[PDB]
Amino acid sequence: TSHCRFYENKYPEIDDIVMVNVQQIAEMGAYVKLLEYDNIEGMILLSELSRRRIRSIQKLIRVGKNDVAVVLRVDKEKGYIDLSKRRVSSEDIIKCEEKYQKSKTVHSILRYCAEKFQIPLEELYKTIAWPLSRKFGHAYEAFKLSIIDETVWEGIEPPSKDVLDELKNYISKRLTPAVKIRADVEVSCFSYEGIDAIKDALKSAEDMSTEQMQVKVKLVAAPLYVLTTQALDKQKGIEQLESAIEKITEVITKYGGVCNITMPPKA
Amino acid sequence: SNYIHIRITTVQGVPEEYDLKRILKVLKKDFACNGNIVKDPEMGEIIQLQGDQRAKVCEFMISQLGLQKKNIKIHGF
Amino acid sequence: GETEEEKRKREFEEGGGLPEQPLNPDFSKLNPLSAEIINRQATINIGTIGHVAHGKSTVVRAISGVQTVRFKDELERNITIKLGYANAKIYKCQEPTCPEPDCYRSFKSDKEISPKCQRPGCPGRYKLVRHVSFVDCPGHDILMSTMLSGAAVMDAALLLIAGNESCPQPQTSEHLAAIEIMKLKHVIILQNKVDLMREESALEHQKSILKFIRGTIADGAPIVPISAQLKYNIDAVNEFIVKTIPVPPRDFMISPRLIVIRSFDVNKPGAEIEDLKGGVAGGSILNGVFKLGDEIEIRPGIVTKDDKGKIQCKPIFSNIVSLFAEQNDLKFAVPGGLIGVGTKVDPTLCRADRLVGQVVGAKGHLPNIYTDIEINYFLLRRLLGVKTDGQKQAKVRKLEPNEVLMVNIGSTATGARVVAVKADMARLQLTSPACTEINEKIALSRRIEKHWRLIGWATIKKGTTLEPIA
Amino acid sequence: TNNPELKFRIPPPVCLRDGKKTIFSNIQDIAEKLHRSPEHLIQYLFAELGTSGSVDGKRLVIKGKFQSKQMENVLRRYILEYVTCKTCKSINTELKRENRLFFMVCKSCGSTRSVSS
RNA sequence: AGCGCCGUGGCGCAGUGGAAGCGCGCAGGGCUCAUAACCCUGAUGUCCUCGGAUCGAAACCGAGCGGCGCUACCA
Numbered sequence A: 001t002s003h004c005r006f007y008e009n010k011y012p013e014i015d016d017i018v019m020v021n022v023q024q025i026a027e028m029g030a031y032v033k034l035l036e037y038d039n040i041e042g043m044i045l046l047s048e049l050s051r052r053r054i055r056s057i058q059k060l061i062r063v064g065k066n067d068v069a070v071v072l073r074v075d076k077e078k079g080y081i082d083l084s085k086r087r088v089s090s091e092d093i094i095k096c097e098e099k100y101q102k103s104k105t106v107h108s109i110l111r112y113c114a115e116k117f118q119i120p121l122e123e124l125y126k127t128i129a130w131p132l133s134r135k136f137g138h139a140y141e142a143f144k145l146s147i148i149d150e151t152v153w154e155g156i157e158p159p160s161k162d163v164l165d166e167l168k169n170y171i172s173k174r175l176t177p178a179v180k181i182r183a184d185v186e187v188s189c190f191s192y193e194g195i196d197a198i199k200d201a202l203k204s205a206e207d208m209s210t211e212q213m214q215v216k217v218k219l220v221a222a223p224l225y226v227l228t229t230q231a232l233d234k235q236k237g238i239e240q241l242e243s244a245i246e247k248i249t250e251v252i253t254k255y256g257g258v259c260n261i262t263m264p265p266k267a
Numbered sequence B: 001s002n003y004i005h006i007r008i009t010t011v012q013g014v015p016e017e018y019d020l021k022r023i024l025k026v027l028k029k030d031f032a033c034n035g036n037i038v039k040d041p042e043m044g045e046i047i048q049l050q051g052d053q054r055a056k057v058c059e060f061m062i063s064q065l066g067l068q069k070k071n072i073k074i075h076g077f
Numbered sequence C: 001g002e003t004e005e006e007k008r009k010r011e012f013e014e015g016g017g018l019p020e021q022p023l024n025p026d027f028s029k030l031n032p033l034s035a036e037i038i039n040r041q042a043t044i045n046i047g048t049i050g051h052v053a054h055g056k057s058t059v060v061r062a063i064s065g066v067q068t069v070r071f072k073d074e075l076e077r078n079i080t081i082k083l084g085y086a087n088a089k090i091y092k093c094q095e096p097t098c099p100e101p102d103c104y105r106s107f108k109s110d111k112e113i114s115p116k117c118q119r120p121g122c123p124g125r126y127k128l129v130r131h132v133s134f135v136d137c138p139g140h141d142i143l144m145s146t147m148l149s150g151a152a153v154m155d156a157a158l159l160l161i162a163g164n165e166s167c168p169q170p171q172t173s174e175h176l177a178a179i180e181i182m183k184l185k186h187v188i189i190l191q192n193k194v195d196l197m198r199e200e201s202a203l204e205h206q207k208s209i210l211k212f213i214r215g216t217i218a219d220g221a222p223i224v225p226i227s228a229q230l231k232y233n234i235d236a237v238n239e240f241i242v243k244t245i246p247v248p249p250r251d252f253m254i255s256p257r258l259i260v261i262r263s264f265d266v267n268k269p270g271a272e273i274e275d276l277k278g279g280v281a282g283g284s285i286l287n288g289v290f291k292l293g294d295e296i297e298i299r300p301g302i303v304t305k306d307d308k309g310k311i312q313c314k315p316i317f318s319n320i321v322s323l324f325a326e327q328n329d330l331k332f333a334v335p336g337g338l339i340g341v342g343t344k345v346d347p348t349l350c351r352a353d354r355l356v357g358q359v360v361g362a363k364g365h366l367p368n369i370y371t372d373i374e375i376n377y378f379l380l381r382r383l384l385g386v387k388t389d390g391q392k393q394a395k396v397r398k399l400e401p402n403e404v405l406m407v408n409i410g411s412t413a414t415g416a417r418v419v420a421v422k423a424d425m426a427r428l429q430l431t432s433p434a435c436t437e438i439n440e441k442i443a444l445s446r447r448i449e450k451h452w453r454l455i456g457w458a459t460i461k462k463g464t465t466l467e468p469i470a
Numbered sequence D: 001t002n003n004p005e006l007k008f009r010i011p012p013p014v015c016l017r018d019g020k021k022t023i024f025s026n027i028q029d030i031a032e033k034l035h036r037s038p039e040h041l042i043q044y045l046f047a048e049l050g051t052s053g054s055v056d057g058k059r060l061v062i063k064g065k066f067q068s069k070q071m072e073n074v075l076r077r078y079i080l081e082y083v084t085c086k087t088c089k090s091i092n093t094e095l096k097r098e099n100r101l102f103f104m105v106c107k108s109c110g111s112t113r114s115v116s117s
Numbered sequence E: 001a002g003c004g005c006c007g008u009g010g011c012g013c014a015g016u017g018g019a020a021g022c023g024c025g026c027a028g029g030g031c032u033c034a035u036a037a038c039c040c041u042g043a044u045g046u047c048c049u050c051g052g053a054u055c056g057a058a059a060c061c062g063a064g065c066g067g068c069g070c071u072a073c074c075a
């Protein structure tokens, strides 16, 4: 049962940035539903329609799809939103789309929860999305921190523990990330040994692999050895792979060989 | 490979031993036709030619740069 | 209802399999034709020479069945830089009834010590007369240094001539001259194309070839028609190899050495580095016996430049972990065979083209790296490898001081600067490290027509030593 | 002995034009007349046009307006590139897999090149 | 042999998460005296074969296929 706007109140705010889904255009413009705030219809007049001059109303609208938008006035007595699209900075259009994406992902998760439990989605949002969005600024960061930290649910009152379990499962399977950090070390050794040296550097670099974040350095070439890690927080890998570099340098500088670095640790 | 062809008009497939704007300057005069050097999102080279003159651009690369003259395919269209 | 693999396994076990080399056999009695040496290692190196766009790897593949790679995408089709290898076993029928020409049968490396004869009607088997190694050499006008190195490694020659093109092709003449330079006379001439030809065209081409080889060093060189595509008349080539080419004097008295022509790294990608292998230098042993677990140093080795422009040579000591020969890991090595020494030398030192023509000596010897060498040179009249369009094939001029000329000392490919010019002798200044052990056969090439072109032969007489930095 | 005639075992293609449906019931016969894998023949014949018909049995079915000379030219070019090795006059040569791609190999000699595009 | 990409509507490009995408083509119709230009409407798919979590997967994941591109023949 799809209801319950993402944000705090049913009434959208003034001058806010939104993402509008189009349904119907007769003569005055496009009075369309909203998928960032509540579904109260916002009306767009032809004057605020086109950045260019409107040439064919059929082409530029593309009914049934979302477009970036702004709201000028909100009728807070029964519901009449005045809305526009041309008066938006070109820099914030992508950010509006990102906010639409975040809301749509959160609502897909919570709609799955509601349709599985037959619980009104307003109940779920008032017990799940609103407290989390308050605690962490946004429900998306709340779910991401739920993935790493299970304490984000503490201080919150679920309607049922089954909701907690199924929601956590769907997050852990749908929001599962963790960016690969990859680098390439060159072996320039003209030296006496150098397979036992690489073996020893391999041992002292693979032992460093922690439980949550393992550094497995594969072989693709004799000189070019690859350094691949799954950076959960995207900041441990830089120092881990710097440690790998210092280890390989310490191994090489005493046995007789020489090595340099081709590709430094990059996300 | 190095497949060169003309599609109703445009020439797609162009080795770049000579400059493409120089290609426009050596096409536009003799052919007298409008030509647009458009960079599509990462296909081969695109050069326009208004009016169907496929044999004329055959004559052209014969004159300027054509050295194989066998993989150039005259499309039906 | 036996599977073909099962029948082959039965024939392999019936044929005695392949007995393993003794860990410590008596060497003062071992001969290159001994059973233990012959079963799992080649004793004679046979190289092939020919002109471009003719096919040498095809003939080697037809003779043996061991493929020659032809790698590097671009080189998969046109020309190869590194040499080609292939192991063939000479098997001769023990039965007198069958005709001599088809008695011999050349098999590939992992065949048993006695396979069954494929001729219909002979219940006899084959006996291993000799195991032969094949060193395919490039025959393009650009790649000569590798061909000269492999011909220095080479001990027996197979010249390939095709008929339908021009009778006096220059590339084969150049390769024959190079072979004549480095003390090698056992040359077998082979007709590449006979099928598409008429019965008199072949005779005319044969008359032309005989006319060609009358004043060169080789005189009694046999000529044999062969096919690379139809795969016929290979047993006759095997018989000619057995008859014409004996074993060059190679006993166990002379000191051990190694001449690496190819560098191979063993790093299988995708597998975790926990289980890896040492680096392999592909080298020929022409003098000495090498055993598992030996200490060895690459003599020219680490070439480095100091801040003052001086060239420092660091010999590359290393312990031999394995000596891969033919098909299986072996315990002892036989001189006169291309063997891969898999040592603990760092795999990046054997990556692409680092040990291409480098001398290596076992611990217990002191080779000499030289910076300035004294050379005795002898020239030829007409430059070989050029088709002059009807005017006097180019006459080689005398050398001039301070010219970078390619002086292929055996396998080492270096560009030396001439410091002194006289009637027979010359001082060569080497920017790249080169070493001398006893004599070393050397080829000389100049730059007259872009690419390198052979002029004559050379022998080191003296040199300025560089004392190793320990 | 082997070649009394001194290849030409390539039959004239037979395509049936039923007004709206073009049927080629000669694909398997040329498969046995060229020593090719019929799956690879069909995959190439799909990859050259904008069509992928139906396989039935030994025959390919497509539903449209097409000629018969086009696949004569297709067969002759395919023979020049795969069915006949450029190096030698032989048909029995075929496609094996020694890496991940298709490697072209011969049957008279055993030439090893990478012809799979 | 591995790693970085792809899986078309004739084609190029897209989001892949509630269910066929946009444009280039093609056909048909409108405009005009008429053409071009312009405007409207269509029909072209296992978005590569097989499974998983999931009320649901073209995608999220894989147990592999077919083709790409980097290493470089990877005894």
Ligand SMILES: Nc1nc2c(ncn2[C@@H]2O[C@H](COP(=O)(O)OP(=O)(O)CP(=O)(O)O)[C@@H](O)[C@H]2O)c(=O)[nH]1
Pocket: C050, C051, C052, C053, C054, C055, C056, C057, C058, C059, C077, C078, C079, C080, C137, C138, C139, C140, C192, C193, C227, C228, C229, D086, D087, D088, D111
């Ligand atoms: N007709 C015919 N073709 C042959 C014969 N031998 C080889 N070929 C052709 O030569 C081709 C292989 O040539 P290849 O051996 O690579 O030439 P190459 O040895 O690299 C030339 P270079 O030694 O100068 O590098 C094959 O495709 C084959 O068709 C022959 O006896 N007859």
Ligand SMILES: [Mg+2]
Pocket: C057, C068, C070, C079, C080, C081, C082, C083, C084, C136, C137, C138
């Ligand atoms: Mg080769």
Ligand SMILES: [Zn+2]
Pocket: D085, D087, D088, D089, D090, D093, D106, D107, D108, D109, D111
């Ligand atoms: Zn063939």
